[PDB]
Swiss-Prot record, chain B:
Upper classification of the organism: Eukaryota, Metazoa, Chordata, Craniata, Vertebrata
Outcome of substituting W44F: Abolishes interaction with CDC25C and reduces centrosomal localization
Post-translational modification: Ubiquitinated by the anaphase promoting complex/cyclosome (APC/C) in anaphase and following DNA damage, leading to its degradation by the proteasome. Ubiquitination is mediated via its interaction with FZR1/CDH1. Ubiquitination and subsequent degradation prevents entry into mitosis and is essential to maintain an efficient G2 DNA damage checkpoint.
Top-level lineage group: Eukaryota
Domain observations: The POLO box domains act as phosphopeptide-binding module that recognizes and binds serine-[phosphothreonine/phosphoserine]-(proline/X) motifs. PLK1 recognizes and binds docking proteins that are already phosphorylated on these motifs, and then phosphorylates them. PLK1 can also create its own docking sites by mediating phosphorylation of serine-[phosphothreonine/phosphoserine]-(proline/X) motifs subsequently recognized by the POLO box domains.
Range of the intact protein held here: 371 to 593 of 603
Protein name in the entry: Serine/threonine-protein kinase PLK1
Family: Belongs to the protein kinase superfamily. Ser/Thr protein kinase family. CDC5/Polo subfamily.
Gene that specifies this protein: PLK1
Cross-link (Glycyl lysine isopeptide (Lys-Gly) (interchain with G-Cter in ubiquitin)): K122
Region described as Linker: spans on this chain: 123-137
Phosphoserine PTM positions: S5, S80
Phenotype upon changing W44F: Loss of centrosomal localization and of S-phase progression
Domain POLO box: 40-118, 140-222
Tissues expressing the protein: Placenta and colon.
Length: 6, 223
């Protein structure tokens, strides 16, 4: 994924 | 690197004992709150495409590891900075007295901070860092790599953290404490001393993750 958890 | 071997040895040791094969598993017996981590990565973003990996540590500080092997840290007073060059040369700056040599990198770091602050959740929000050693200093991201299932973060203090994308389970390994912090899918966390897991054992889920962990350490180690 491009970033951690929203 | 000296610490990755410690970990490796620690993981070899606990995995080798097949913790999930005990006649009876008494996982709660492996717990040790005096081992709770001081720092871990609470949130991250990836621009390794055009700049680098931006991340926030549990104590709200923000750091960036640029593709050019340099790190810029912004401590939680929203002003103190620490630039670390490839050769390891550390230097202090301030966003208040924003330099000219790193305006671009400070603006980037400020963009990540704003992004992580608007869309990202804070992993371990319910954890309380321990009153650990005070002469210890804030760690920076040494190196990181991703797989199809998880992201692996290596911190300058020796800790390695693995965040699993699908179930959202995480691991925070510390070779100094010889312990592992597991955060399950329900966001509940627990810290165990690896040697104790060796004695009392653990469930299927924590054990497969400790096997996958030795694997990722091996990958960190051979790079």
């Amino acid at each position: 994924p491009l970033h951690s958890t929203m | 690197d000296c610490h990755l071997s410690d970990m490796l040895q620690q993981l070899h040791s606990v995995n080798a004992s097949k913790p999930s094969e005990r006649g009876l598993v008494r996982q709660e017996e492996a717990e040790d709150p005096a081992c709770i981590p001081i720092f871990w990565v609470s949130k991250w973003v990836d621009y390794s495409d055009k700049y680098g990996l931006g991340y926030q540590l549990c104590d709200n500080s923000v750091g960036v590891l640029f593709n050019d092997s340099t790190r810029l840290i912004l401590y939680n007073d929203g002003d103190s900075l620490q630039y670390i060059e490839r050769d390891g040369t550390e230097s202090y700056l301030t966003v208040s007295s924003h330099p000219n040599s790193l305006m671009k990198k400070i603006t980037l770091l400020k963009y990540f901070r704003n992004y992580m602050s608007e869309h990202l959740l804070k992993a371990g929000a319910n954890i309380t860092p321990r009153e650990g050693d005070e002469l210890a200093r804030l760690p920076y991201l040494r190196t990181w790599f991703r797989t199809r299932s998880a992201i692996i973060l290596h911190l300058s203090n020796g800790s390695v953290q693995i965040n699993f994308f699908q179930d959202h389970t995480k691991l925070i390994l510390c070779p100094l404490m010889a312990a592992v912090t597991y955060i399950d899918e329900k966001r509940d966390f627990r810290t165990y001393r690896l040697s104790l897991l060796e004695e009392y054992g653990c469930c299927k889920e924590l054990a497969s993750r400790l096997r996958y962990a030795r694997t990722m350490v091996d990958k960190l180690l051979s790079s």
